[PDB]
Motif scaffolding. Structure first.
Motif, mmCIF file in Angstrom:
data_model
loop_
_atom_site.group_PDB
_atom_site.id
_atom_site.type_symbol
_atom_site.label_atom_id
_atom_site.label_comp_id
_atom_site.label_asym_id
_atom_site.label_seq_id
_atom_site.Cartn_x
_atom_site.Cartn_y
_atom_site.Cartn_z
ATOM 1 N N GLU B 9 0.849 -1.182 0.000
ATOM 2 C CA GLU B 9 0.000 0.000 0.000
ATOM 3 C C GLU B 9 0.887 1.234 0.000
ATOM 4 O O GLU B 9 1.795 1.350 0.829
ATOM 5 C CB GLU B 9 -0.936 0.025 1.209
ATOM 6 C CG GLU B 9 -1.761 1.298 1.298
ATOM 7 C CD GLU B 9 -2.944 1.167 2.232
ATOM 8 O OE1 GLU B 9 -3.148 0.068 2.789
ATOM 9 O OE2 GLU B 9 -3.673 2.166 2.407
ATOM 10 N N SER B 10 0.622 2.152 -0.924
ATOM 11 C CA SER B 10 1.430 3.349 -1.089
ATOM 12 C C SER B 10 0.584 4.590 -0.849
ATOM 13 O O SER B 10 -0.604 4.631 -1.183
ATOM 14 C CB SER B 10 2.054 3.408 -2.486
ATOM 15 O OG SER B 10 2.788 4.606 -2.667
ATOM 16 N N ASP B 11 1.213 5.604 -0.262
ATOM 17 C CA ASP B 11 0.549 6.872 -0.004
ATOM 18 C C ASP B 11 1.551 8.002 -0.185
ATOM 19 O O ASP B 11 2.762 7.784 -0.225
ATOM 20 C CB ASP B 11 -0.065 6.917 1.398
ATOM 21 C CG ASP B 11 -1.310 7.779 1.460
ATOM 22 O OD1 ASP B 11 -1.580 8.506 0.481
ATOM 23 O OD2 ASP B 11 -2.018 7.732 2.489
ATOM 24 N N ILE B 20 5.283 6.724 0.714
ATOM 25 C CA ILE B 20 5.382 5.785 1.822
ATOM 26 C C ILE B 20 4.744 4.482 1.373
ATOM 27 O O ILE B 20 3.560 4.456 1.018
ATOM 28 C CB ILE B 20 4.696 6.330 3.081
ATOM 29 C CG1 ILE B 20 5.262 7.705 3.423
ATOM 30 C CG2 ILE B 20 4.883 5.372 4.242
ATOM 31 C CD1 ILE B 20 4.745 8.273 4.703
ATOM 32 N N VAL B 22 4.077 0.406 2.342
ATOM 33 C CA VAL B 22 3.995 -0.573 3.418
ATOM 34 C C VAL B 22 3.629 -1.916 2.806
ATOM 35 O O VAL B 22 2.595 -2.035 2.138
ATOM 36 C CB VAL B 22 2.968 -0.165 4.483
ATOM 37 C CG1 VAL B 22 2.971 -1.159 5.630
ATOM 38 C CG2 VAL B 22 3.250 1.238 4.986
#
Lengths: 50, 49
Positions: B9-11, B20, B22
């Motif tokens: 998961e990217s943000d 970021i 994860v």
């Protein structure tokens, strides 16, 4: 004064791996006319009837 | 037991100006049958051929 009704905004937190939802509201309250209200202080007994 | 395969998961972190990412997994390990495994304790001495 009714500035903003409750509305909800959502966001995604990748650090904590979750969803954050915030519901907010904006208002103010005051006594407008000092003559239009009366308060009665009574008790919580159910009167003996019949 | 597999609840979630390893996934990314990217943000966007604007305050840090970056991505970021994860990678997460959810699982649980346990002994299924108490009769199918045997463990042998030995030493690290290598005998001479």
């Amino acid at each position: 004064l009714k500035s903003k009704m409750p509305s909800a905004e959502s966001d995604r937190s990748v650090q904590y791996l979750g969803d954050i939802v915030v519901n907010s509201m904006v208002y103010g309250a005051k006594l407008f006319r000092q003559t239009n209200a009366v308060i009665i202080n009574h008790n919580a007994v159910i009167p003996a009837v019949v």
